[PDB]
């Protein structure tokens, strides 16, 4: 049983692995593969490494207790991004247009 403001969460969840935004969304899906993309210094780089299907196993097992932390999770996928690329990196600007999706819905959120 998810609360009002969890259900609003788990919505923008769901819009953000939808189809509508799969063309940006994409490198966000999954966790990043270090060792597959030969990022031989991801992991010293991000310490703690945030993906959607992370977020959604997390929502899904109940463990998110309010907005902000769903919120917190979310910002820190996005922030990893921003720290680990150069900020022309097509990946960065696939985050930007993703977070833009997210910021816009969360500032919606029911009182
Ligand atoms: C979530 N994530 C993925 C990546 C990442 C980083 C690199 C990368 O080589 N970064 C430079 C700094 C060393 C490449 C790719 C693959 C790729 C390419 C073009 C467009 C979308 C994805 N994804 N970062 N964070």
Redesign the pocket.
Known sequence: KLSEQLKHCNGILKELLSKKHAAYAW??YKP?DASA?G?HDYHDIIKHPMDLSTVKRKMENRDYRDAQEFAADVRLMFS??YK???PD???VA?ARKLQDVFEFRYAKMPD
Request: with cysteine.
């Open positions: 490198p966000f990043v993309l990022l990893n991004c680990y690329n150069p990196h097509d990946v696939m």
